[PDB]
Design an enzyme around this catalytic site. Sequence first.
Site, PDB file in Angstrom:
ATOM      1  N   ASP A   1       0.988  -1.161  -0.073  1.00  0.00           N
ATOM      2  CA  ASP A   1      -0.099   0.061  -0.303  1.00  0.00           C
ATOM      3  C   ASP A   1       0.919   1.390   0.001  1.00  0.00           C
ATOM      4  O   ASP A   1       1.987   1.434  -0.265  1.00  0.00           O
ATOM      5  CB  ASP A   1      -0.995   0.062   1.147  1.00  0.00           C
ATOM      6  CG  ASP A   1      -2.454   0.784   0.743  1.00  0.00           C
ATOM      7  OD1 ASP A   1      -2.282   1.940   0.400  1.00  0.00           O
ATOM      8  OD2 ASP A   1      -3.486   0.170   0.880  1.00  0.00           O
TER       9      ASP A   1
ATOM     10  N   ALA B   1      -7.011   2.878  -5.229  1.00  0.00           N
ATOM     11  CA  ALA B   1      -7.914   3.876  -5.850  1.00  0.00           C
ATOM     12  C   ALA B   1      -8.205   4.858  -5.059  1.00  0.00           C
ATOM     13  O   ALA B   1      -8.039   5.309  -3.864  1.00  0.00           O
ATOM     14  CB  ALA B   1      -9.274   3.391  -6.495  1.00  0.00           C
ATOM     15  N   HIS B   2      -8.536   6.134  -5.955  1.00  0.00           N
ATOM     16  CA  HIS B   2      -9.209   7.271  -5.160  1.00  0.00           C
ATOM     17  C   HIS B   2     -10.615   6.847  -4.992  1.00  0.00           C
ATOM     18  O   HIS B   2     -11.203   6.596  -6.049  1.00  0.00           O
ATOM     19  CB  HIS B   2      -8.898   8.526  -5.961  1.00  0.00           C
ATOM     20  CG  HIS B   2      -9.318   9.818  -5.518  1.00  0.00           C
ATOM     21  ND1 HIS B   2     -10.597  10.227  -4.838  1.00  0.00           N
ATOM     22  CD2 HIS B   2      -8.610  11.131  -5.121  1.00  0.00           C
ATOM     23  CE1 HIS B   2     -10.895  11.255  -4.406  1.00  0.00           C
ATOM     24  NE2 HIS B   2      -9.452  12.121  -4.673  1.00  0.00           N
TER      25      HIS B   2
ATOM     26  N   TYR C   1     -15.365  10.677 -10.100  1.00  0.00           N
ATOM     27  CA  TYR C   1     -14.926   9.279  -9.798  1.00  0.00           C
ATOM     28  C   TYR C   1     -14.966   8.293 -10.992  1.00  0.00           C
ATOM     29  O   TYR C   1     -14.034   7.717 -11.544  1.00  0.00           O
ATOM     30  CB  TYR C   1     -15.520   8.812  -8.760  1.00  0.00           C
ATOM     31  CG  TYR C   1     -15.176   7.312  -8.309  1.00  0.00           C
ATOM     32  CD1 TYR C   1     -14.237   6.910  -7.976  1.00  0.00           C
ATOM     33  CD2 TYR C   1     -16.382   6.565  -8.424  1.00  0.00           C
ATOM     34  CE1 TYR C   1     -13.811   5.602  -7.330  1.00  0.00           C
ATOM     35  CE2 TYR C   1     -16.358   5.309  -7.536  1.00  0.00           C
ATOM     36  CZ  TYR C   1     -15.097   4.840  -7.379  1.00  0.00           C
ATOM     37  OH  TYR C   1     -14.770   3.561  -7.123  1.00  0.00           O
TER      38      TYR C   1
ATOM     39  N   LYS D   1     -12.148   6.757 -13.646  1.00  0.00           N
ATOM     40  CA  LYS D   1     -12.280   5.339 -13.159  1.00  0.00           C
ATOM     41  C   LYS D   1     -12.495   4.553 -14.809  1.00  0.00           C
ATOM     42  O   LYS D   1     -11.689   3.919 -15.186  1.00  0.00           O
ATOM     43  CB  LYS D   1     -13.231   4.687 -12.470  1.00  0.00           C
ATOM     44  CG  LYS D   1     -12.921   5.273 -10.894  1.00  0.00           C
ATOM     45  CD  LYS D   1     -11.982   4.216 -10.135  1.00  0.00           C
ATOM     46  CE  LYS D   1     -12.170   2.848 -10.233  1.00  0.00           C
ATOM     47  NZ  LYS D   1     -11.344   1.945  -9.627  1.00  0.00           N
TER      48      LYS D   1
HETATM   49  N1  LIG Z   1     -15.941   1.236  -2.213  1.00  0.00           N
HETATM   50  C1  LIG Z   1     -16.938   1.267  -3.026  1.00  0.00           C
HETATM   51  O1  LIG Z   1     -18.317   1.643  -2.931  1.00  0.00           O
HETATM   52  C2  LIG Z   1     -16.487   0.795  -4.470  1.00  0.00           C
HETATM   53  C3  LIG Z   1     -15.126   0.651  -4.674  1.00  0.00           C
HETATM   54  N2  LIG Z   1     -14.747   0.091  -6.004  1.00  0.00           N
HETATM   55  C4  LIG Z   1     -13.482  -0.312  -6.320  1.00  0.00           C
HETATM   56  O2  LIG Z   1     -13.012  -1.095  -5.471  1.00  0.00           O
HETATM   57  C5  LIG Z   1     -11.733  -1.070  -5.512  1.00  0.00           C
HETATM   58  C6  LIG Z   1     -11.572  -1.095  -3.976  1.00  0.00           C
HETATM   59  O3  LIG Z   1     -12.423  -0.201  -3.232  1.00  0.00           O
HETATM   60  P1  LIG Z   1     -12.292  -0.138  -1.606  1.00  0.00           P
HETATM   61  O4  LIG Z   1     -11.747  -1.439  -1.139  1.00  0.00           O
HETATM   62  O5  LIG Z   1     -13.717   0.292  -1.316  1.00  0.00           O
HETATM   63  O6  LIG Z   1     -11.565   1.100  -1.513  1.00  0.00           O
HETATM   64  P2  LIG Z   1     -10.942   1.700  -0.025  1.00  0.00           P
HETATM   65  O7  LIG Z   1     -11.416   3.151   0.139  1.00  0.00           O
HETATM   66  O8  LIG Z   1     -11.386   0.866   1.123  1.00  0.00           O
HETATM   67  O9  LIG Z   1      -9.628   1.298  -0.341  1.00  0.00           O
HETATM   68  C7  LIG Z   1      -8.742   2.396  -0.959  1.00  0.00           C
HETATM   69  C8  LIG Z   1      -7.163   1.892  -1.143  1.00  0.00           C
HETATM   70  O10 LIG Z   1      -6.377   2.679  -2.127  1.00  0.00           O
HETATM   71  C9  LIG Z   1      -5.367   3.037  -1.380  1.00  0.00           C
HETATM   72  N3  LIG Z   1      -4.886   4.518  -1.485  1.00  0.00           N
HETATM   73  C10 LIG Z   1      -5.315   5.454  -1.411  1.00  0.00           C
HETATM   74  N4  LIG Z   1      -4.433   6.414  -1.681  1.00  0.00           N
HETATM   75  C11 LIG Z   1      -3.592   5.605  -2.501  1.00  0.00           C
HETATM   76  C12 LIG Z   1      -2.440   6.320  -2.935  1.00  0.00           C
HETATM   77  N5  LIG Z   1      -2.173   7.689  -3.094  1.00  0.00           N
HETATM   78  N6  LIG Z   1      -1.585   5.375  -3.500  1.00  0.00           N
HETATM   79  C13 LIG Z   1      -1.879   4.135  -3.460  1.00  0.00           C
HETATM   80  N7  LIG Z   1      -2.984   3.552  -2.893  1.00  0.00           N
HETATM   81  C14 LIG Z   1      -3.778   4.581  -2.254  1.00  0.00           C
HETATM   82  C15 LIG Z   1      -5.803   2.920   0.109  1.00  0.00           C
HETATM   83  O11 LIG Z   1      -4.769   3.009   0.990  1.00  0.00           O
HETATM   84  C16 LIG Z   1      -6.721   1.749   0.210  1.00  0.00           C
HETATM   85  O12 LIG Z   1      -5.820   0.466   0.214  1.00  0.00           O
HETATM   86  C17 LIG Z   1     -11.444   0.148  -6.078  1.00  0.00           C
HETATM   87  O13 LIG Z   1     -11.046  -0.008  -7.411  1.00  0.00           O
HETATM   88  C18 LIG Z   1     -12.543   0.986  -5.908  1.00  0.00           C
HETATM   89  O14 LIG Z   1     -12.712   1.965  -6.877  1.00  0.00           O
HETATM   90  C19 LIG Z   1     -15.972  -0.119  -6.758  1.00  0.00           C
HETATM   91  C20 LIG Z   1     -17.322   0.150  -6.708  1.00  0.00           C
HETATM   92  C21 LIG Z   1     -17.750   0.780  -5.359  1.00  0.00           C
END
Ligand SMILES: NC(=O)C1=CN([C@@H]2O[C@H](COP(=O)(O)OP(=O)(O)OC[C@H]3O[C@@H](n4cnc5c(N)ncnc54)[C@H](O)[C@@H]3O)[C@@H](O)[C@H]2O)C=CC1
EC number: 1.1.1.133
Lengths: 298, 298
Positions: free
Chosen positions: A30, A63-64, A128, A132
């Site tokens: 991470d 992701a952001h 977003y 994406k």
């Molecule tokens: N959370 C949701 O409602 C949804 C998420 N997704 C997708 O699923 C995936 C995972 O989502 P979650 O687990 O919810 O995300 P989350 O918000 O829980 O995790 C975000 C991740 O991105 C990392 N991150 C943040 N800034 C960073 C940076 N500058 N460089 C490298 N890593 C960085 C964080 O450290 C973390 O590990 C992402 O692709 C997201 O866009 C898709 C649909 C909905």
Amino acid sequence: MNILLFGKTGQVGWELQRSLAPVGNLIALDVHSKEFCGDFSNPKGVAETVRKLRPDVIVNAAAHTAVDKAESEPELAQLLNATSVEAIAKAANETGAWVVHYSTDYVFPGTGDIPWQETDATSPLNVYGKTKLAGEKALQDNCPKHLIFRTSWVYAGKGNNFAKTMLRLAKERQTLSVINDQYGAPTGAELLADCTAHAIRVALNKPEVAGLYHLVAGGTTTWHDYAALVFDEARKAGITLALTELNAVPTSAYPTPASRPGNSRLNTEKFQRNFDLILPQWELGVKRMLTEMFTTTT
Amino acid sequence: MNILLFGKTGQVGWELQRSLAPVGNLIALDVHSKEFCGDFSNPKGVAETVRKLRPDVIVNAAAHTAVDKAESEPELAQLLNATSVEAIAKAANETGAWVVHYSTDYVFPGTGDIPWQETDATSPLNVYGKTKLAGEKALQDNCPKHLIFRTSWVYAGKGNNFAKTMLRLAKERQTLSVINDQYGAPTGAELLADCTAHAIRVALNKPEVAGLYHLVAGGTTTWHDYAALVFDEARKAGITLALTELNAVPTSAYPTPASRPGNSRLNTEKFQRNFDLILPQWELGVKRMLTEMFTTTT
Ligand SMILES: NC(=O)C1=CN([C@@H]2O[C@H](COP(=O)(O)OP(=O)(O)OC[C@H]3O[C@@H](n4cnc5c(N)ncnc54)[C@H](O)[C@@H]3O)[C@@H](O)[C@H]2O)C=CC1
Ligand SMILES: NC(=O)C1=CN([C@@H]2O[C@H](COP(=O)(O)OP(=O)(O)OC[C@H]3O[C@@H](n4cnc5c(N)ncnc54)[C@H](O)[C@@H]3O)[C@@H](O)[C@H]2O)C=CC1
Ligand SMILES: [Mg+2]
């Protein structure tokens, strides 16, 4: 074989740390990874990392993900949801590595009733979604051994989630207001992680499965109906709730900077037949995370 | 396809509820299952259930697992660890269903240094081991599409476990005593569940993988060294511990009704090459369950 996972601390990432562990030798990174670059602010640095390790499979869960803040900083989002995805894609393709990547329904507009398909046209309703989109297109154009999983309403039991926020409210409040006109399927990080692990093992054996997939738990509900189940579940577990009144309310009445779709429904027939996997009804995953939260040996 | 899981509420079962959900349509039973028989006290009734549903795969995570109590009631153990396993095996074989089943190292004696292999001779040191031996032999003789996973020192984050019991002690006590001459690999219910899910998907495609397997996390430690890691982990997370003195002690000095082996080490090369899966070092799984316990959004 070697697997490299970025975003290990996120909701999906934390579950991937578990799911990917038997599938190959896992290196989990991470942002703060000291001994390896895992910060998508340095697209060149995540490239270096991907060259430094040479993976057979890259799983990107970083992701952001703060949709509203993204409207105020579309630049940083672009960097995280597209620029670094291209940089990792191109590097992946230097070595014939597979890239697994998560996207979102925010890639589509809104028109209740019908579930979006992979062959549907995209027009992102907010930032977003846009960054994406740039991300999956970039993956699509730079690295043919890919698996993009478009998902929606993702939750995990570790960390904050809708269920919990609602429960805090239901403890501290008597009446509550929640949207009843946004439609989707809450999708567990557990389901995401496990499906990913299986899809990787097929793809290694059948490279033709490469492509874009809709991946969500089955069924459909709204935030208000989701919250009702959480309330009921908690009442069934003996959680006392101050909450007496539960009112449904339209989306518009209360502000969000970035627009949310009224229709997050996704059709997942493509994934089900290409991987021969099952996608259970959304309630299962939620009730299970609720039980784990409620029966907390501690 | 249809998957039937008995023992859904156990440590491994609770993780199988998650792991098996994408692999097929899951029907999850335990003892109290009202609308279906899941009580191994009624071997004929679990047969009926298995006829009532017709599964393609049966995953059995139910067992008599209180080793010490088993010495006082070898009859009930026999029923749960062998009789019902035969009844479910024979019924499985009526329909060509696969049966997945967990066993234990208590099937071997004790002789430090060397990890037991599947080709090694068995001589169970206590009742538990004996009835479980009767169980795998019965499965072996009545249902050729089987996968027996011999495991050891199994823990999960839900429910009581060694880590937790030790932490309760370390909070309430200043000095503590723990065995340092029993050797094995603490194996997570997460690892068990996920490996099972993958092994099922291979077996469906390659029936020759059928047979007996050793399945444990890699490495080796003792209860005292395991407890040290838990202590250190908790000190690293800010858990204050009353505990000041940690002494290693031999096995004998303190009574257990049923004998424990000094050598629970298991070689797992058979499983690794037949399924092309990786078995991570035991510490990973433990540190992860510890983090989940310590970073409990609640
Ligand atoms: N959370 C949701 O409602 C949804 C998420 N997704 C997708 O699923 C995936 C995972 O989502 P979650 O687990 O919810 O995300 P989350 O918000 O829980 O995790 C975000 C991740 O991105 C990392 N991150 C943040 N800034 C960073 C940076 N500058 N460089 C490298 N890593 C960085 C964080 O450290 C973390 O590990 C992402 O692709 C997201 O866009 C898709 C649909 C909905
Ligand atoms: N727990 C351990 O240290 C080890 C366990 N194993 C094996 O792994 C498997 C799972 O173990 P755990 O998840 O630890 O077990 P557990 O003790 O957590 O779960 C026991 C399961 O058996 C079920 N059960 C109890 N009485 C029953 C009855 N009369 N009829 C039907 N089900 C009944 C319980 O309801 C529960 O679902 C078992 O085969 C066990 O023998 C193997 C090595 C060590
Ligand atoms: Mg979990």
